Amino acid sequence: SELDQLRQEAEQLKNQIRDARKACADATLSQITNNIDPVGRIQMRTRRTLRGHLAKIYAMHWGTDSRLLVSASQDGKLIIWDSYTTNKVHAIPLRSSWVMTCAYAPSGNYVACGGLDNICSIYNLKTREGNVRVSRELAGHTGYLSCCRFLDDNQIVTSSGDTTCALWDIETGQQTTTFTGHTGDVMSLSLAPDTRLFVSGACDASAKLWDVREGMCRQTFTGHESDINAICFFPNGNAFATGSDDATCRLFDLRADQELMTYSHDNIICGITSVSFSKSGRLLLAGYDDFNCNVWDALKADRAGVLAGHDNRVSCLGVTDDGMAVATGSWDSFLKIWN
Amino acid sequence: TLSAEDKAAVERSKMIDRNLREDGEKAAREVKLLLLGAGESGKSTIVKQMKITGIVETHFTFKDLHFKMFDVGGQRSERKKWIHCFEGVTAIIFCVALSDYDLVNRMHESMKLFDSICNNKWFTDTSIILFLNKKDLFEEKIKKSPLTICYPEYAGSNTYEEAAAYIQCQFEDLNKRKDTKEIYTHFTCATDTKNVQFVFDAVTDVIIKNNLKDCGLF
């Protein structure tokens, strides 16, 4: 039997993995940051309220100019908002109302969205005809889209329900790189700040660090109990934090290859739908489904503050690139911008 | 006080608001229906009765009422990660092949699917229409093949009506919260016309309950 001794080799190699990353944990991040003074109480007010959607929204994404944000919902619309004046600059009708993710291009020329229809449709905002229209539809991916993210105007990575992330080329319309290796279906995705590599999170309770060029998984990060729903890099690009159904946020390091800190409390038992970091990375913002957001001190693992404006599940959140504001969207059809 | 271009951007946003309000009034008056059930259980037969790659949309109108039917069984993943997208549906059309009682425990996994959908936290008030498909092939199959091989605890006659009523009592005894939701059960053949009438009669009670909820009467 080649088969049984092949898992004997795999179990020995995974034991070598656990021993190697056990040998690097000399002192935890709690022991390093006892000297650091805490952040104090973070109290953020609702500066804006974007009330245009008529159903549950599932995603938002900030633009790179920190003023335009897109938000997608189940009434077949994704609306681009002026965050400063609460103006709707576009309302794009969708071919399928079931949309679970949306993304904004870093150039600002494109938005992408996709859901249960298996297709990440890409919309051209800067048309000479004056209306937005479908640029390309990216099909052949056999599962619900969980997160689309642009690398530039031509590269886009998706994550699916068929346990598979894929890098696409928009002009040819064909997927160029296929990222397989996850066992349950991938739910979230986060690009690194240089966009040279990315992480994805699945229902394996496992996060995997990928590589865009060579196309193969480098590191695999375990430690969660239930399914991880959200993931986000630290702004250095050397760390990332995940969120799951455990009421735990855990952050990992790409160099140290393991856990660094767990963000949990006894009062919180519900799942985590969205994570993001601040601009300095000092505080991470987790969006829950006990209807509010918790501000976690990312170094000292303390609850800095609560963002409690929503009356349903906080489904999506994101921080601006200049770090001024936090917009949180939720299943009560309202976007709120916090500062 | 705004500038001229800020004023024109404000009136553009107000026209976008009027279009969104009009489309929401369009979408709020349409009945959404969720098809569930296993494959080869007469799902496509029911689609051809209402009419004549992840999610399949079906649009049909009947007695001045617009229906959208979402066949979602074409795409296969973990169902718990997207079944909350279908809360707020008007009704769930579940369908079970009656002639799959002997084939392979296929009736038992169909019961497990109805047990998972019917006692889900997102469908705690949704009324489930339970079609029972291929009753004629069931009635030739029960005279030759017994129904005790599906149900070891069954004791009853091998006629159509008592055995079909036994399968009805099982499927209506899957649910726990009897008070919250309603289950409408129908026996359908391949060639019958009354199924879209039965769906309409089941939808009208949900329409009455939401018309009371819109008028604050609960």
């Epitope: 003023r67 335009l68 002026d82 004046t85 103006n87 600059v89 576009h90 600002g108 000479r128 005809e129 004056g130 209306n131 | 500038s3 001229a4 271009e5 800020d6 004023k7 024109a8 951007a9 009136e11 553009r12 026209m15």
Partner: single-chain antibody, 231 residues
Framework: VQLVESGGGLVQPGGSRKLSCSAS????????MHWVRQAPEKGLEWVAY????????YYADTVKGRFTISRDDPKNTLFLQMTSLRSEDTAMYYC??????????????WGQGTTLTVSADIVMTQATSSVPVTPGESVSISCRSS???????????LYWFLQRPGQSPQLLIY???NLASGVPDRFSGSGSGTAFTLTISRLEAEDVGVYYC?????????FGAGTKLEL
């Protein structure tokens, strides 16, 4: 895209005439439309404006009461009903599309023009009426505003246009700093409150024509008299 003017000709004074602008190739109901005229040896003069959905209509004060702008969205046609035509209404009339959201570029496309012959504002001052221009050399023109165009939101509502000889004008620089689409990066705009500069470094051929600067801070919109580039 295409905007086609029609309805000109010789009109007796005191008479009436309806001008028509037929749109083609763009989503016409999402666009605010303008009429801008040009007296046959003079500069550009703004006439009227109708917004999207016909909810906001402005006129110039020289034509207020006499002119009626109206649009018909299902057949994509812009109208200008003109009554009691005077001899100062002998001009060539352009219909202009313009859309206003965050980051939009209004006054981007202009119609070809119809020619009709009749038998407290912000004053924009072009500094020179004509400059001698050598090809290849850099040139830089300027105009000045009577009021500071820098609004409190950070925007400066200064638009630059170029009219080639015998052609419609086209947008070069919108909102003092931003290049229009299809315009080369030789053109550059710079300035401050009420003092503005359009720079054409490494001038090529077919940059030759009259250049107009326009404010869009307040209605009515006022142009300059035009700076002519001559070889």
């Amino acid at each position: 895209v295409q905007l086609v003017e029609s309805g000109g000709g010789l009109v007796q004074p005191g008479g009436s005439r309806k001008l028509s602008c037929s749109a083609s190739g763009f989503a016409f109901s999402s666009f605010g439309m303008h009429w801008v005229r040009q007296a046959p040896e003079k500069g550009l003069e703004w006439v009227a404006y109708i917004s999207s959905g016909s909810g906001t209509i402005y006129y110039a004060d020289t034509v207020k009461g006499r002119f009626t702008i109206s649009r018909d969205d299902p057949k994509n046609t812009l109208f200008l009903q003109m009554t009691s035509l005077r001899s100062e209404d002998t001009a060539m009339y352009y219909c202009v599309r313009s859309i206003y959201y965050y980051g939009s570029s209004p006054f981007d496309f202009w119609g070809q023009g119809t020619t009709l012959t009749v038998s407290a504002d912000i004053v924009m001052t072009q500094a020179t009426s004509s400059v001698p221009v050598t090809p290849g050399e850099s040139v830089s023109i300027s105009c000045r505003s009577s009021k500071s165009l820098l609004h409190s939101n950070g925007n400066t509502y200064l638009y630059w246009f170029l009219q080639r000889p015998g052609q419609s004008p086209q947008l070069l620089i919108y909102r003092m700093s931003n290049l229009a689409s299809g315009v080369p990066d030789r053109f550059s705009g710079s300035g401050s409150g009420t003092a503005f500069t359009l720079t054409i470094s490494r001038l090529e051929a077919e940059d030759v024509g009259v250049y107009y600067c326009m404010q869009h801070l307040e209605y009515p919109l006022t142009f300059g008299a035009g700076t002519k580039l001559e070889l």
